[PDB]
Design a binder for these strands. Structure first.
Ligand SMILES: [Mg+2]
Ligand SMILES: [Zn+2]
Ligand SMILES: [Zn+2]
Lengths: 1226, 99, 471
DNA sequence: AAACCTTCCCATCAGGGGAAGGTC
DNA sequence: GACCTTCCCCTGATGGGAAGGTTTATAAT
């Protein structure tokens, strides 16, 4: 019924259009009848009837005579709901400016006349006159004057000279103004006069003029001649309990405006002086502005209450209220919540739902299904049947639940997995059963956490909860290909317990037929579980054309691993169950299962693993006691030794052999190096603790200490908590960071004393508060990310660019951090990649680089792959499937319609809640320098002269597995292209973050200590002496040489004077500015920079996210640009890129561009859709600006649609929008 | 607590989040994002169209659910019409265009 | 500063105060202006003809004696009978003696007895407006006769004023300019109908106002000057004593009304107290102005305080009840009994509870609810208007059940039922209404209805409908 | 806040009339 | 059978009352 939302200026007549009356008396419901008063703020005649299909007078009650205005009251008997649609207006006496068009930072009325704000504000307050349309006099057309200035001024020129004061003056000035002639004049002032000052406001004033004309709305409308009123149903006066009436602040403000306007008119007809009427006009302006926006003039308070009343604009913006708490997030029917618990017996696809909850939820289904089966006469009877809890209705509920998926949500929703669809399982009680394997994805515990349930209604929402949201369809996370479904504490512990072996278990070394007999041995109680028994096992392995071949044979194993083999699926070999089977092992086993047998097998495998784990981990005893913690009997000594090692340092400082900050480190180093002693005392005594006789020979093996198995399995206990458990727990520091020279010396088992607990208390408080107060930080980051992302969806099949970013492994310092295979897997090639020999084809132009091509390229020495990215893709208002990649809950190419923007924003936002000498080559190969200038000296060896110098290692393969940087003037012992031995020191010299970090990385903020860059090659040169800062000239080689710059002398340099330095060189040290990285390098360099830096902060701690996601943010950051020339053309990159290129296809000349770099919060500012901007950004501003321009929103995007309540143009909504938009506009 | 069809706020026709258990659950922005991540479109719509707003949507959906017909008839979220009022009651004129 | 209260608080520091000199000095100026405008009416025969009609109707029960006169400058009811025939001593000496030579120096003594009767401002303003309407009527004709010759016939303005100044009565000037043979002369015969007949509404005024067209202009010419004097004086008066209004208004802080609202509603009463003040009585102006200022503040409060406006009387009564409850806190020890103020007040007993029951104030829906959270009162407000869907379904089911059942009866009974009740039809019909177009009337239908309601009262055809009743 | 006064809207009372009832 | 007294419904009166309006004189900044 609509496909376009427009916003324009409200004209004083277009207002009288909507209004169904003129509120005159500042009244309400009467006082004694509670009935609306004539021409009041609730007048039934003006707005609408009180009752439904009934008049106020009470003469017309029947629904028959609907359209009629009873001459008694003038109230047309109709639906009382119309009192919500009924507008109104007020005939303001003196003109009044709209505050929004005067107070917003780009003051609309202000730069509409090029008149400074401090002047118009003086005119409004009636503290100065102003000339208007002088024509030919001693005064201009816009000029200010005071009392004595206006005194002897009308005598000079009575006619042709007009000068008003206040709102009348501003308005009439806007009326006689020519938004056409003035525009033609401002064109040349930008054309000839140089000096940006002449172009600062002009370049933005010409735009306001031309847009003010193109829209159509006139400038006189900047002054509200008629004030529209709000329907009484949007500001109800409704009564309440006890008789007290509850009203809105909008009323108080409206009543005020009406009172003061009435008073002004009464004065104007009562023949009052000017000192009174000019005060009334200002009071009126005050009331009106406080009604539209309260908090910009003086914050008019409310009545009996001291709190300031809420105005109109305040009912729109802010996280609270409309647009944020109403249109994007609302409460919903058919839902609930409860405390969640365990539920192992449940399958990975089902969840236990409390019975009574299901009854109340599916009430509407139950009623109908009952009245259908001949069990309830009518709907009302079915209600009583379920209200009585008759036996039949339970079976009816079981019939309606049957395959009807439901949705479960965990309170903080970081990623998409926060909402997952399960299959209802009716259960007794009131607790919600949840599947343990999903607790990881949900990131929930069973310590009292609550979850919410949602029941779909449409057959669609029931299918999407089965083929999109169902649990068993979401196994591997989209952020990283690693599965989000991995065994937790008890499961991994049971498995690790089974897959163990000591040496002398009851009956070890024998042989059995297979798993059946091994279990017959365990359960009977004849054999142990950890015996080293070797048996036969048939390991299926489909080979040679895809035909399953079962090769049976014997292997070395344990009685336990062979039993666990009964759960293992077919295709997987036995090598997966030959180890200690820790958490980090079970997970990779399941992963290989997934990408060997498929989804369907992996699901049942996971469920079986969970059941078996829990059972075995239970029956293994697997407890903890006071004796388990093994306090090293060496502790006492190890303590007192290092306790006396400071007694010499104390005298060293008492005499003067070491200063304070010198013996401080003398204590700190001996204490840190002594803590390893106490920590390793229990460690090497706990990793080999248990000692038993193998067949009769004493020997030590992997210990069986209850606390330790929980560590080697990764179940719960990490390593540090062990050093704290049995030994003393470290040294704490005050908030200063002053680590105290008084370490803890007692452990947790012995018990801490009063003194020692204080420093622990500070450490605890810092951790507690730093994690608690960080919630809003990560939330804010991901929120701005989703606001920069949403509109970005996968639409186009193939863009058609060979561009591709250049993917190379991270290899840095010592060893690789992430191989090339990962940052290339599942992506797409840009250009044909060949073998180390030229003119070959390892892979064609562009093809999905799935596991196969990964292995194939891994065989060759090709460590450099050209992969297409989202940062470079020929696509308008979207992306092409190839450039993105494949990553999803499946290894297939990204589908046409999934909104990659939102999923990427979540993929970055969820991991956010976790953050806060010489060189020695290792591997053997050949020294391969890179970008270094050298010179021979006395020693005959080589020395570096260029600050930047890379140290690669060309091995016998031809790849690079080493990369070290060496500063200026280094000691070299091989040279470039020289052979090296097993770790030869070829380098020597004299050496003389978190979430707030990634926030800056995305915001493109300018660094504190920037580093200048070069704009062209050629010898650099100095210039004029130290005046204020310093100078620096650029000397190009062949082309023009007009480039230069001023670099302060207080900032040291690094570049060489008489040396060629290409563009984008290190002209100084310090951090780097991304804006300067886009200009002198290009669009791929900057994205390659932001990704490499943002990946480091996440790489520090255990976080992994495919570069693809971050690439999408980078691409959204450069969607704007600046034009260099004009060309044949008459900002947004895509729009100009198509609009000028269509005429560039024509012989007409094109116009060049320059990518601009806008932060995630500065790019989310400018957007085609104004509604989506005013949704999260500064609504009050956005709307004012997009209103003077007459901007027109066609919504084309996600948030706008969810606002107007429409199928989002993505996914299931993208298919509907496909079929609609096809015939739409065509 | 749980709710299927309860009361509604007067100002904005949304399920009353009070009455301490008889009120409907809150479906904030992050939940909408999680829905946007999947292809689920009718789920999100029926969330913020039938189950909250749309004075006709609730009634039509309820009268359909009992007829064995699971089909929503999405309308216009009442909160958005109220937003149109609050914007148009100002010196701003907001409107809608073709079918 | 910014706030517009500062613009005003320092807008009065300009005009210096006025005490003991200012008051009595400029009040004389006020009266000296109204004296100029008063004698302007002294020569206006329409005022005499209008005074007779409103005078004799006083003795015929329409207009009160003290409602048309504030007194005579010459509360005594006996001073009337002695000035209703002694003033006519010049009535008939100048009117019927035009048969107008000695009728030029005998008009002042006839108008002298007209300035000893102070009329109430109510009729005085009607007299001023009468002279204004007469000026506008006379002038309409000039702005007609002028643009009919200048803007149409293209004649110089000076040749118009020269031939018009002095006559303004007859057509001796128009038809005399025809012999000038000027370029505009040959264009004066066409407009000889819009200027000749134009004097029918202009010259006739002379026989109504008994004065030449030009004298009617002289009177208003000086009257405007007088009224301007009065205005220019009163504005300065209120500017001087402005500070007094603020002094009084600062006694109402939390009166449900902003400060400037109060000071303005008080300035209105200041103006009113000025216009009705006589410097003759001697009593200073500060005593008199305070009454109107303070009352125009108090009653204004009573009218703009409550969002639900209440008649003034009730405000007074409620405040009195509050006062009595206040002055008795120290007597009873804590607070008076409910039925105690019934006697202390003049009003009866049972009206106390209602007067206090309606005295509630509306609470802002934005008042934050408990827990101090952003949750406000406007969030817990329900909606008891929309019927729940569980009943809408019952309605849509009963519709069909009744339809099928009624379609089970006869055709006659079917239409009769769908007629007597508003079933699938606009507005049900009464007895003879149905009989009007069913060919048998007044008891036929009364039998058909009972027969059908009985054929449905029987079971096996009502089970479906009967289930819809549950009590 | 009190004091005297006009307009309007109330929900009710003498008065008229159209017949109505009952008898010297 | 009339004549007198009686029994109920419209006109319009007109008592009652809530709701408004105008003044109030020591001076009062
Ligand atoms: Mg928890
Ligand atoms: Zn009516
Ligand atoms: Zn592409």
């Amino acid at each position: 019924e609509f496909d376009a939302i427009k916003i324009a200026l409200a004209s004083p007549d277009m207002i009288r259009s909507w209004s169904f009356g003129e509120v005159k008396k500042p009244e309400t419901i009467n006082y004694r009848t509670f009935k609306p008063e004539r021409d009041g703020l609730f007048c039934a005649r003006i707005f609408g009837p009180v009752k439904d299909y009934e008049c106020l007078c009470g003469k017309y009650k029947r629904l028959k005579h609907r359209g009629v205005i009873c001459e008694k009251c003038g109230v047309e008997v109709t639906q009382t709901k119309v009192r919500r649609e009924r507008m109104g207006h007020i005939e303001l006496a003196s003109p009044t400016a709209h505050i929004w068009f005067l107070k917003s930072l780009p003051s609309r009325i202000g730069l509409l006349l090029d008149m400074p704000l401090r002047d118009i504000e003086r005119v409004l307050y009636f503290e100065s006159y102003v000339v208007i349309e002088g024509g030919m006099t001693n005064l201009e057309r816009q000029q200010i004057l005071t009392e004595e200035q206006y005194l002897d001024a009308l005598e000079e020129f009575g006619d042709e000279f007009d000068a008003k004061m206040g709102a009348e003056a501003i308005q009439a000035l806007l009326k006689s103004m020519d938004l056409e002639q003035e525009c033609e004049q401002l064109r040349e002032e930008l054309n000839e006069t140089n000096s940006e000052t002449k172009r600062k406001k002009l370049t933005k004033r010409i735009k306001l003029l031309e847009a003010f004309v193109q829209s159509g709305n006139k400038p006189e409308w900047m002054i509200l001649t008629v004030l529209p009123v709000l329907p009484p149903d949007l500001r109800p006066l409704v009564p309440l309990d006890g008789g007290r009436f509850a009203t809105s602040d909008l009323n108080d403000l409206y009543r005020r405006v009406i009172n003061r306007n009435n008073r002004l008119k009464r004065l104007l007809d009562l023949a009052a002086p000017d000192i009174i009427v000019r005060n009334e006009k200002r009071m009126l302006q005050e009331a009106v502005d406080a009604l539209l926006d309260n908090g910009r003039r003086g914050r008019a308070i409310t009545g009996s209450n001291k709190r300031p009343l809420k105005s109109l604009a305040d009912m729109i913006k802010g996280k609270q209220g409309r647009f944020r708490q109403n249109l994007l997030g609302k409460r919903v029917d058919y839902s609930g919540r409860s405390v969640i618990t365990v539920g192992p017996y449940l399958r990975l696809h089902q969840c236990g739902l409390p019975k009574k909850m299901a009854l109340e939820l599916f009430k509407p289904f139950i009623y109908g299904k009952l009245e259908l089966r001949g069990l309830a006469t009518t709907i009302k009877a079915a209600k009583k049947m379920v209200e009585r809890e008759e036996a039949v209705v339970w079976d009816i509920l079981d019939e309606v639940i049957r395959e009807h998926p439901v949705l479960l949500n965990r309170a903080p929703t970081l990623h998409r997995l926060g909402i997952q669809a399960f299959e209802p399982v009716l259960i007794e009680g009131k607790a919600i059963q949840l599947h343990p394997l999903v607790c990881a994805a949900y990131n929930a515990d069973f310590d009292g956490d609550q979850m919410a349930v949602h029941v779909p209604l449409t057959l669609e929402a029931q299918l999407e909860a089965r083929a999109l949201m169902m649990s068993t369809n979401n196994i591997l996370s989209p952020a990283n290909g690693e599965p989000i479904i991995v065994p937790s504490q008890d499961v991994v512990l049971g498995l690790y317990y089974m897959t163990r072996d000591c040496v002398n278990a009851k009956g070890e070394g024998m042989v059995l037929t297979g798993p059946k007999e091994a279990e017959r041995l365990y359960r009977s109680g004849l054999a142990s579980l950890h015996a080293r028994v070797k048996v036969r096992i048939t390991e299926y392995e489909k080979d040679a054309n895809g035909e399953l071949v079962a090769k049976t044979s014997l292997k070395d194993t344990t009685v336990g691993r062979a039993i666990l083999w009964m759960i293992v699926p077919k295709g997987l070999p036995y090598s997966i169950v030959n180890q200690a089977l820790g958490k980090k092992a079970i997970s990779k086993m399941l992963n290989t299962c997934y990408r060997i047998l498929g989804l369907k097998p992996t699901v049942i495998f996971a469920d079986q693993i969970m059941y078996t784990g829990f059972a075995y981990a239970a029956r293994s005893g697997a407890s903890v006691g006071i004796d388990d913690m093994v306090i090293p009997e060496k502790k006492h000594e190890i303590i007192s030794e290092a306790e006396a090692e400071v007694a010499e340092i104390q005298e060293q400082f008492q005499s003067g052999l070491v200063t304070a900050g010198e013996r401080y480190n003398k204590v700190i180093d001996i204490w840190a190096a002594a803590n390893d002693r106490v920590s390793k005392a229990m460690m090497d005594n706990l990793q080999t603790e248990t000692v038993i006789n193998r067949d009769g020979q004493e020997e030590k093996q992997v210990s069986f200490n209850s606390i330790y198995m929980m560590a080697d399995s990764g179940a719960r206990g990490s390593a540090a908590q062990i050093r704290q458990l049995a030994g003393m727990r470290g040294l704490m520091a005050k908030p200063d960071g002053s680590i105290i020279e008084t370490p803890i010396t007692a452990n947790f088992r012995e018990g801490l004393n009063v003194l020692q607990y204080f420093i622990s208390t500070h450490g605890a408080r810092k951790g507690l508060a730093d994690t608690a107060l960080k919630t809003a930080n990560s939330g804010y980051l991901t929120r701005r990310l989703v606001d920069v992302a949403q509109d970005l969806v996968v639409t186009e099949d193939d863009c058609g660019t060979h561009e591709g970013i250049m993917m190379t492994p991270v290899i840095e310092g010592g060893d690789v951090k992430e191989p090339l295979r990962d940052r290339v897997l599942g992506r797409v090639t840009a250009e044909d990649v060949l073998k180390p020999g030229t003119a070959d084809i390892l892979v064609p132009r562009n093809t999905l680089l799935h596991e196969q091509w990964c292995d194939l390229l891994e065989e060759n020495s090709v460590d450099a792959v050209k992969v297409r990215s989202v940062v470079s893709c020929d696509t308008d208002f979207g992306v092409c499937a190839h450039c993105y990649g494949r990553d999803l809950a499946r290894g297939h190419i990204i589908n046409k319609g999934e909104a990659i923007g939102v999923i990427a924003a979540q993929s970055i936002g969820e991991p956010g809640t976790q953050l806060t000498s010489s060189i020695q080559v290792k591997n053997k190969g050949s020294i391969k320098l890179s970008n270094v200038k050298s010179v021979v000296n006395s020693s005959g060896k080589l020395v570096i002269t260029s600050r930047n110098t890379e140290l690669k290692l060309i091995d016998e393969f031809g790849r690079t597995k080493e990369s070290y940087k060496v500063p200026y003037g280094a000691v070299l012992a091989k040279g470039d292209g020289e052979q090296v031995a097993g770790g030869e020191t070829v380098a020597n010299w004299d050496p003389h973050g978190g979430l707030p970090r990634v926030a800056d990385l995305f915001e493109a903020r300018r660094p504190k200590e920037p580093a200048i860059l070069a704009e062209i090659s050629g010898i650099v040169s100095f210039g004029k002496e130290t005046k204020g800062k310093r100078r620096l000239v650029i000397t190009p080689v062949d082309g023009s040489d007009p480039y230069e710059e001023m670099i302060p002398k207080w900032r040291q340099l690094n570049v060489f004077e008489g040396e060629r330095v290409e563009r984008g060189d290190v002209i100084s040290d310090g951090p780097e500015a991304p804006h300067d990285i886009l200009r002198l390098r290009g669009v791929h360099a900057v994205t390659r920079y932001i990704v490499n830096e943002v990946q480091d902060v996440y790489r520090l701690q255990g976080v992994k996210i495919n570069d693809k996601h971050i690439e999408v943010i980078v691409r959204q950051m450069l969607r704007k640009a600046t034009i260099v020339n004009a060309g044949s053309s008459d900002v947004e990159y895509s729009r100009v890129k198509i609009a000028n290129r269509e005429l560039e296809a024509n012989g007409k000349v094109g116009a060049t561009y320059s990518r601009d770099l806008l932060g995630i919060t500065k790019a989310s500012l400018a957007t085609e859709s104004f509604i989506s901007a005013a949704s999260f950004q500064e609504t009050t501003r956005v709307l004012t600006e997009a209103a003077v321009a007459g901007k027109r929103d066609e919504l084309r995007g996600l948030k706008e649609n969810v606002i107007v309540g429409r199928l989002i143009p993505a996914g299931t909504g993208y298919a509907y929008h496909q079929d609609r938009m096809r015939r739409r506009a065509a | 607590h749980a709710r299927s069809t309860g009361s509604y706020s007067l100002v904005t026709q949304q399920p009353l989040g009070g009455k301490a258990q008889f009120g409907g659950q809150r479906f904030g922005e992050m939940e909408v994002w999680a829905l946007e991540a999947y292809g689920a479109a009718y789920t999100l719509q029926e969330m913020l169209t039938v189950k909250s707003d749309d004075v006709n949507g609730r009634t039509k959906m309820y009268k359909n659910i009992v007829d064995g017909n699971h089909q929503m008839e999405p309308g216009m979220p009442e909160s958005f019409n109220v937003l149109l009022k609050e914007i148009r009651s100002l010196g701003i004129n907001i409107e809608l265009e073709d079918e | 500063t910014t706030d517009p209260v500062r613009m005003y608080m320092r807008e009065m520091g300009t005009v210096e105060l006025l005490t003991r000199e200012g008051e009595i000095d400029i009040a004389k100026r006020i009266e000296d202006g109204i004296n100029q405008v008063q004698c302007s009416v002294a020569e206006y025969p329409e005022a005499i003809t209008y005074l007779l009609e409103q005078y004799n109707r006083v003795e015929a029960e329409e207009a009160r004696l003290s409602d048309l006169i504030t007194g005579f400058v010459d509360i005594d009811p006996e001073l009337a009978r002695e000035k209703f025939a002694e003033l006519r001593a010049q009535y008939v000496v100048t009117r019927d003696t035009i048969k107008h030579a000695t009728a030029q120096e005998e008009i002042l003594k006839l108008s002298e007895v007209f300035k000893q009767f102070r009329l109430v401002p109510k009729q005085f303003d009607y007299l001023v407006n009468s002279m204004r309407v007469m000026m506008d009527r006379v002038r309409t004709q000039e702005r007609l006769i002028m643009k009919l010759c200048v803007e149409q016939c293209k004649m110089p303005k000076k040749n118009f004023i020269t031939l018009f100044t002095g006559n303004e009565t007859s057509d001796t000037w128009f038809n005399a300019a025809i012999a000038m043979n000027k370029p505009w002369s040959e264009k004066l015969h066409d407009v000889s109908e819009e200027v000749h007949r134009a004097l029918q509404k202009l010259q006739q005024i002379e026989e109504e106002t008994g004065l030449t067209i030009e004298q009617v202009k002289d009177i208003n010419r000086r009257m405007s000057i007088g009224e301007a004097k009065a205005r220019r004086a009163k504005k300065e008066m209120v500017e001087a004593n402005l500070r007094l209004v603020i002094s009084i208004a600062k006694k109402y802080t939390n009166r449900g009304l902003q400060f400037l609202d109060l000071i303005q509603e008080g300035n209105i009463g200041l103006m009113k107290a000025v216009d009705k003040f006589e410097y003759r009585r001697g009593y200073k102006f500060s005593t008199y102005a305070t009454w109107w200022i303070r009352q125009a503040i108090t009653r204004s409060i009573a009218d703009q305080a409550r969002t639900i406006r209440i008649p003034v009387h009730m405000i007074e009564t409620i405040n009195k009840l509050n006062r009595i409850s206040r002055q008795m806190l120290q007597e009873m020890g804590r607070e008076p009994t409910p039925e105690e103020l019934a006697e202390r007040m003049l009003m009866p007993e049972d009206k106390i509870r209602k007067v206090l029951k309606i005295a509630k104030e509306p609470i802002s829906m934005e008042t934050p609810i408990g827990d101090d959270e952003d949750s406000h009162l406007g969030d817990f407000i329900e909606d008891t208007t929309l019927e729940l869907p569980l009943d809408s379904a019952t309605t849509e089911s009963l519709r069909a059940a009744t339809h099928d059942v009624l379609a089970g009866l006869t055709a006659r009974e079917a239409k009769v039922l769908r007629m007597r009740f508003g079933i699938d039809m606009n507005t049900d019909y009464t007895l003879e209404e149905v009989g009007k177009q069913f060919d048998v009337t007044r008891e036929r239908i009364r039998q058909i209805e009972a027969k059908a309601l009985r054929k449905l009262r029987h079971p096996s055809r009502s089970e479906v409908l009967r289930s819809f009743l549950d009590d």
